[PDB]
PDB file with SEQRES, HELIX, SHEET and CRYST1 records, atoms N, CA, C and O in Angstrom:
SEQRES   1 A   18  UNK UNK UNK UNK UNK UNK UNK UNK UNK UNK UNK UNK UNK          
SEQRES   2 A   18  UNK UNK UNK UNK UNK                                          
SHEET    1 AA1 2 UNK A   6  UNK A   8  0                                        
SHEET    2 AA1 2 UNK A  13  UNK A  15 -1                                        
CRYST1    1.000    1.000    1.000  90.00  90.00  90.00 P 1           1          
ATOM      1  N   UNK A   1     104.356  56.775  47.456  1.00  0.00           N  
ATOM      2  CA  UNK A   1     105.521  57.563  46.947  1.00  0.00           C  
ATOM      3  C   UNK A   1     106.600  57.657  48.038  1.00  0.00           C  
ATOM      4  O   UNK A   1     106.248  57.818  49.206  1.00  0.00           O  
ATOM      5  N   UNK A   2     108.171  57.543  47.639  1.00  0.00           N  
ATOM      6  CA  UNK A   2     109.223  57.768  48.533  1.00  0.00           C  
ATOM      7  C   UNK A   2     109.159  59.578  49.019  1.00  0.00           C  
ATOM      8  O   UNK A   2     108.262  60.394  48.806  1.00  0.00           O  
ATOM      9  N   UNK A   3     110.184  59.711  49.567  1.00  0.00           N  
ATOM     10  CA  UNK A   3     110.739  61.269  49.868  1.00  0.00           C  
ATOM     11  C   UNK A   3     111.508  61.534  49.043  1.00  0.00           C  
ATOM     12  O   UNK A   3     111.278  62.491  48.303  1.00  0.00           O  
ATOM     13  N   UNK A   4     112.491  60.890  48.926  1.00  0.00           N  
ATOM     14  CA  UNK A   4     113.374  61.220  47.728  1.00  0.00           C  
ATOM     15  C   UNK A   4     113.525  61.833  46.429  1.00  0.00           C  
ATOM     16  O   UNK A   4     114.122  60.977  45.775  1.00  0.00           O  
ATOM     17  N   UNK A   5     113.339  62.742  45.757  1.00  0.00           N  
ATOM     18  CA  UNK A   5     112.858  63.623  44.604  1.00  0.00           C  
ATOM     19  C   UNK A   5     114.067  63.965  43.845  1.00  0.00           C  
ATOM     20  O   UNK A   5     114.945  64.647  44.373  1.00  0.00           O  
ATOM     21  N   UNK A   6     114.157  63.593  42.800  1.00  0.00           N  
ATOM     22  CA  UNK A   6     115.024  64.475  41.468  1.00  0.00           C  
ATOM     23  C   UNK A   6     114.263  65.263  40.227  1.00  0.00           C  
ATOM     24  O   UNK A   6     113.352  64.720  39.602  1.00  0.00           O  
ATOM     25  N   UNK A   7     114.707  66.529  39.950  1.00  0.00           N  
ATOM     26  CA  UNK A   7     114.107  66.929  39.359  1.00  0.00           C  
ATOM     27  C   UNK A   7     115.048  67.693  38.469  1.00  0.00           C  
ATOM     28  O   UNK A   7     116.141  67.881  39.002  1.00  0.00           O  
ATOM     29  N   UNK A   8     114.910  68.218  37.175  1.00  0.00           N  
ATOM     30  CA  UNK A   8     115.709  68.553  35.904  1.00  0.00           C  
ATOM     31  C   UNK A   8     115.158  70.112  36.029  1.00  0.00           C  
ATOM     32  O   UNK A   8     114.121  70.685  35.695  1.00  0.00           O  
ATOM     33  N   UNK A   9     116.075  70.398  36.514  1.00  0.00           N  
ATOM     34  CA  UNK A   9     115.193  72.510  36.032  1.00  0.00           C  
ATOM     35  C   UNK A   9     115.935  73.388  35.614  1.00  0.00           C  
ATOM     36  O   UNK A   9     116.885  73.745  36.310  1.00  0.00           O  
ATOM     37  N   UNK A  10     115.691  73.961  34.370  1.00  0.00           N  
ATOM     38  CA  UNK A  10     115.812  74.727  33.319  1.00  0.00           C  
ATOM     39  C   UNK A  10     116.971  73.764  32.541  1.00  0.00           C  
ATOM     40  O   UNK A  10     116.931  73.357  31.380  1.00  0.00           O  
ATOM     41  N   UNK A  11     118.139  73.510  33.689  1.00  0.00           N  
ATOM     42  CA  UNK A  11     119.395  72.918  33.005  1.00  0.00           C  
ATOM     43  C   UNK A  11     120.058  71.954  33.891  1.00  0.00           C  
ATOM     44  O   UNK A  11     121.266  71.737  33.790  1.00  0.00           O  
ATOM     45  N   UNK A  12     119.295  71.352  34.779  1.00  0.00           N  
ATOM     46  CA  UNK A  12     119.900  70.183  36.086  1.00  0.00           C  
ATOM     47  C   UNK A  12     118.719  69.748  36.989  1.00  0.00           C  
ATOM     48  O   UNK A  12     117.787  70.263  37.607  1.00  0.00           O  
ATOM     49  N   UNK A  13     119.315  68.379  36.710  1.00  0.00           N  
ATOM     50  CA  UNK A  13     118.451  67.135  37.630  1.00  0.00           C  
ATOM     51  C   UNK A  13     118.859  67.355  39.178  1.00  0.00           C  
ATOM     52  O   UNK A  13     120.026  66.978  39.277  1.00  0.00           O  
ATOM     53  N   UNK A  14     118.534  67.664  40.029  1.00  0.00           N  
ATOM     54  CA  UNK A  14     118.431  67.664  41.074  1.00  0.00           C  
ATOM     55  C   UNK A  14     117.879  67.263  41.941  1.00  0.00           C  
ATOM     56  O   UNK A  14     116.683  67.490  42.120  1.00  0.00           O  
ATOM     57  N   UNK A  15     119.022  66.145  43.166  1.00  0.00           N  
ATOM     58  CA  UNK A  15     118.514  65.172  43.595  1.00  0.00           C  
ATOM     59  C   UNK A  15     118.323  66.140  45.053  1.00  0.00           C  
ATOM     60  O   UNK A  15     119.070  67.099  45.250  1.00  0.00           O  
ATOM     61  N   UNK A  16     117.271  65.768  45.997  1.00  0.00           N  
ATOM     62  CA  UNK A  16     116.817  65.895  47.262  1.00  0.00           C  
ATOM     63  C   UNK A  16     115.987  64.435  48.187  1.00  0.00           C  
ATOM     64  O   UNK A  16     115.794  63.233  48.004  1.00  0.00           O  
ATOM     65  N   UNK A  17     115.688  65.530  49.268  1.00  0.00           N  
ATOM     66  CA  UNK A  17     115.157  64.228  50.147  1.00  0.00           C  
ATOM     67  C   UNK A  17     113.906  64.517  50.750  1.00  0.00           C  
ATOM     68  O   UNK A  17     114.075  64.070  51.884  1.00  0.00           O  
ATOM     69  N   UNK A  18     113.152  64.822  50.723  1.00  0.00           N  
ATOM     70  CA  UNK A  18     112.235  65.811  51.889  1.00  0.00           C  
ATOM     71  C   UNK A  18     111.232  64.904  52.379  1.00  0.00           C  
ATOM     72  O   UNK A  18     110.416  65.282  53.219  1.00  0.00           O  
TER      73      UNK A  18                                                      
END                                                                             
Protein backbone atom coordinates (compact mmCIF):
# COMPACT_ATOMS: atom_id res chain seq x y z
CA UNK A 1 0.00 0.00 0.00
CA UNK A 2 1.12 3.78 -0.84
CA UNK A 3 0.82 6.72 1.93
CA UNK A 4 -1.29 8.60 0.05
CA UNK A 5 -5.08 8.29 1.22
CA UNK A 6 -8.43 9.85 -0.05
CA UNK A 7 -11.28 9.43 1.67
CA UNK A 8 -15.20 10.68 1.18
CA UNK A 9 -16.65 11.67 4.77
CA UNK A 10 -20.06 12.41 5.45
CA UNK A 11 -19.86 14.93 2.31
CA UNK A 12 -15.97 15.10 0.86
CA UNK A 13 -13.23 13.05 -0.57
CA UNK A 14 -10.31 14.00 1.07
CA UNK A 15 -7.00 13.74 -0.20
CA UNK A 16 -3.84 13.29 2.38
CA UNK A 17 -0.42 11.84 2.66
CA UNK A 18 0.72 10.16 5.81
Amino acid sequence: RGGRLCYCRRRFCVCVGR
